[PDB]
Amino acid sequence: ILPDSVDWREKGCVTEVKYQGSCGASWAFSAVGALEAQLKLKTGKLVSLSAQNLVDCSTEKYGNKGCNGGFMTTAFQYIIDNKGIDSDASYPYKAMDQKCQYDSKYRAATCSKYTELPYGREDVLKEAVANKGPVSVGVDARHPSFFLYRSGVYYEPSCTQNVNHGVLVVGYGDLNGKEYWLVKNSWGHNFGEEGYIRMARNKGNHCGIASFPSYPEIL
């Protein structure tokens, strides 16, 4: 039996909203966000992890292009292969492509594995969000209605299932019966509902929210 609503922010499992600025590193913020939650679950401590570490180091071998986009899955694989990721404090976000500056001295997390969820399965996503934690997802964000969103449950008829922007599902619920996914963005505190957007849930994989979900785990 799954809870009707979840909000991982209420459990201390979500860090402050970040601002990617003019560097297309949403994939990096989505990956660290998911891992931050697992680190909290495991160690009891909440610390922002370095999105910049991913931008600079999870590069061509991982199919990523830093400020020109990437995948959360291969970000996790990088952390796995690298045997860690630095704290955001030690390796702060500069919103540009840099030389890899990873230093094991300032490692704040590791990752053992990651799991991908099946395409379009909102039922499976719900279950992972309830039972595992926040889940990294892609959405189709190429719609003025998306970046102009201020409040409520976002539904956009022109939205497609083909994803182009990485975000973090940190919960789910309903607003007077309109089901939603509670989504953490990386466009700062001024986007939407204090950095968050509530996006239509159980409406046919709206904006591809459930197209390519993944989440990491720490042994």
* Residue ranges that bind ligand N2A, judged by CB under 6 A: 26-27, 62-65, 68-74, 138, 163-166, 212
Q: Which residue is nearest to ligand N2A (CB)?
A: 69
CB 95 within 8 A of CB 67: yes
71 or 93: whose CB is closer to ligand N2A?
71
Q: How far is the CB of 139 from ligand N2A (least distance, A)?
A: 8
| Residue partners of 200: CB distance under 8 A and separation at least 6 | 153, 154, 155, 178, 179, 180, 181, 206, 207
Beta carbon of residue 8, minimum distance to ligand N2A (angstroms, whole number): 20
State in angstroms the smallest separation of the CB of 89 from ligand N2A: 25
Q: How far apart are CA 120 and CA 212, in angstroms?
A: 8
The number of beta carbons lying within 10 Å of the beta carbon of residue 142 is: 14
- Least CB distance to ligand N2A at residue 119 (A): 9
Choose between 62 and 93: whose C-beta lies nearer to ligand N2A.
62
Q: How far apart are CA 34 and CA 55, in angstroms?
A: 16
Residues in the chain: 219
Considering the complex, state which of residue 135 and residue 153 has its C-beta at the smaller distance from ligand N2A.
Answer: 135
Of the pair 13, 28, the CB lying nearest ligand N2A is at 28
- Residue type at 172? Y
